[PDB]
Amino acid sequence: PPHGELQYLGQIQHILRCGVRKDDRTGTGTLSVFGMQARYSLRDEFPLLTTKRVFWKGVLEELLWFIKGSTNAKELSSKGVKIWDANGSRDFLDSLGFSTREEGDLGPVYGFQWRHFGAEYRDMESDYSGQGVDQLQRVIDTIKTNPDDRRIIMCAWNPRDLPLMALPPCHALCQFYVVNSELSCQLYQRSGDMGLGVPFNIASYALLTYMIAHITGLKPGDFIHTLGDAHIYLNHIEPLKIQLQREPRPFPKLRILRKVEKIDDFKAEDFQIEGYNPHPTIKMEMA
Amino acid sequence: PPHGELQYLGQIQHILRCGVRKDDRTGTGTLSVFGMQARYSLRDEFPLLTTKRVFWKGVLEELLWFIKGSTNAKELSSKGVKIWDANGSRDFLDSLGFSTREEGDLGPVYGFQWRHFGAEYRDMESDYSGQGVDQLQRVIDTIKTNPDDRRIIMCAWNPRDLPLMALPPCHALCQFYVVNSELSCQLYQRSGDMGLGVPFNIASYALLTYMIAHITGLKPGDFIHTLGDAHIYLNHIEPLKIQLQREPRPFPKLRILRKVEKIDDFKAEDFQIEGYNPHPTIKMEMA
Numbered sequence A, B: 001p002p003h004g005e006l007q008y009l010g011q012i013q014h015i016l017r018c019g020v021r022k023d024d025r026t027g028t029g030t031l032s033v034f035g036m037q038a039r040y041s042l043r044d045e046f047p048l049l050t051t052k053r054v055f056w057k058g059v060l061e062e063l064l065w066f067i068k069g070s071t072n073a074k075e076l077s078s079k080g081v082k083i084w085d086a087n088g089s090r091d092f093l094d095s096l097g098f099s100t101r102e103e104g105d106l107g108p109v110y111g112f113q114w115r116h117f118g119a120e121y122r123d124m125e126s127d128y129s130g131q132g133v134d135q136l137q138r139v140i141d142t143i144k145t146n147p148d149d150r151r152i153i154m155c156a157w158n159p160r161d162l163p164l165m166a167l168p169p170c171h172a173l174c175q176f177y178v179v180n181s182e183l184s185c186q187l188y189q190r191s192g193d194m195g196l197g198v199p200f201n202i203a204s205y206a207l208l209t210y211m212i213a214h215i216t217g218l219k220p221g222d223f224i225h226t227l228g229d230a231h232i233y234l235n236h237i238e239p240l241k242i243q244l245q246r247e248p249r250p251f252p253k254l255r256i257l258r259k260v261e262k263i264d265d266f267k268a269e270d271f272q273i274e275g276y277n278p279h280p281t282i283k284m285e286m287a
């Protein structure tokens, strides 16, 4: 029975061989395929890639920051995870014509869309309690009451809010699915940087699934990752060919250390990755 | 190259062989698989299924009806297509608690979200011009000016609006992609009745791509159909095994009969399906 990591490595291989050359907004150049889908089993394994070290601290801390609805890069910055920092900087905000906005204000990105979809965004300090739709809690209650439901969706693509956003979300929607007591999740990702983004993104949605599984009493099933524009940046080709030579190692397991009742209650300390000794990190220049 | 239709038929097969029983509200039951993807080439052919007849005129009228932003079932019904009629009727509306709604008023469904995303829904009679995001035109404008864009999305899944819709959308979002003068489109369909609904859905989005390609000077590229809950109703199993007997006849072609430059300008008479040779319609009862 093949290693789950092979779905991912297979996709890189496919894009390297069949991707078509396609310029991008950043100017870097890509090899590009439109429309891909892979399936990672969450059953007694957590698919944290092993052919390079993935930023597990970043994934967990960033997901908790989404859960709490934060739209303040500094709030994540402070937990030791700098991934959003450039996007909240003075210069960049200015780049986009957001001169009035205070630094760190990312606008109505994921955390606001997850907890407050449709509320009038003001700034990153505002109290949004009980405004907009709480999609994350709705997904959880739907699972608890009607697992057969075919509309368990959370959606961060808000055409109305895109003008106000630092970055338009790559992870546009996700759907949950339950049969035989197993919770699955399919993410629609409109845009995937295969090198730097995608491994992080898989870990991030798998983690969401385990969290949701845990508070609804279900076992984690499958994470189905669907891609729009799946791309390898031209300058990721060499780092990736090195990656492609390494041997997958067993995926870690993910242990949740205490029974947790509300998704809001999860703390970073609740979670232990166990058995993860990946091949070394591989830097890939950000585009 | 294998017939495109085989993608669909092989999905039916997979669900028959591999799907798991899952209940729905009707008490029909389904076999179900979560997460599937098929690719239909649009180059010089049009995937209107041939192993049963597809309701092409329903497809074309319905798509033109969405493009106008209509949410009134009666406007479609006057074209000879009755697919939305039940959902707009006095008894149905009452069943949803829209006791005071004019009959035909579907609430903010596809047409409204496509043309007026995020406007406050009034009724099916209202003038909406100027309000909401005209996602369909924005997608068009973006294809002409910035074909490389990885953000060309139209979203019908509006959590704010769901409580007011006759039905929640099955097609939650679609993404467009351009490379080498070819326009592709991926649909994310959260829920697919494989027998009754999917061959229709496929024709629908293939048609839309053909329309947009036309007005932007592009060749049709690929249609990628992604599915969440891909299901066969138990009372379709037998009809489907009849269908699987049949061997696909070359897909017809779509000719568009005149130069049209605004998507609103398309009329049904503008389109000819040429060389469609389906086996007979197979009746499949609505769940």
Ligand SMILES: O=c1ccn([C@H]2C[C@H](O)[C@@H](COP(=O)(O)O)O2)c(=O)[nH]1
Residues within 6 Å of the ligand: A024, A025, A026, A168, A170, A171, A191, A192, A193, A194, A196, A197, A198, A201, A287, B150, B151
């Ligand atoms: O979680 C994320 C965020 C971004 N990206 C990549 C995809 C693109 O390369 C780029 C976003 O830029 P656009 O697709 O918007 O051009 O970052 C990811 O892979 N994952």
Ligand SMILES: O=c1ccn([C@H]2C[C@H](O)[C@@H](COP(=O)(O)O)O2)c(=O)[nH]1
Residues within 6 Å of the ligand: A150, A151, B168, B170, B171, B191, B192, B193, B194, B196, B197, B198, B201
């Ligand atoms: O364009 C459409 C609309 C509906 N359905 C099917 C999918 C489900 O069987 C049902 C919708 O019911 P829910 O998924 O909302 O329960 O209709 C389609 O296949 N295509």
Ligand SMILES: [Cl-]
Residues within 6 Å of the ligand: A053, A054, A055, A196, A199, A200
């Ligand atoms: Cl990483």
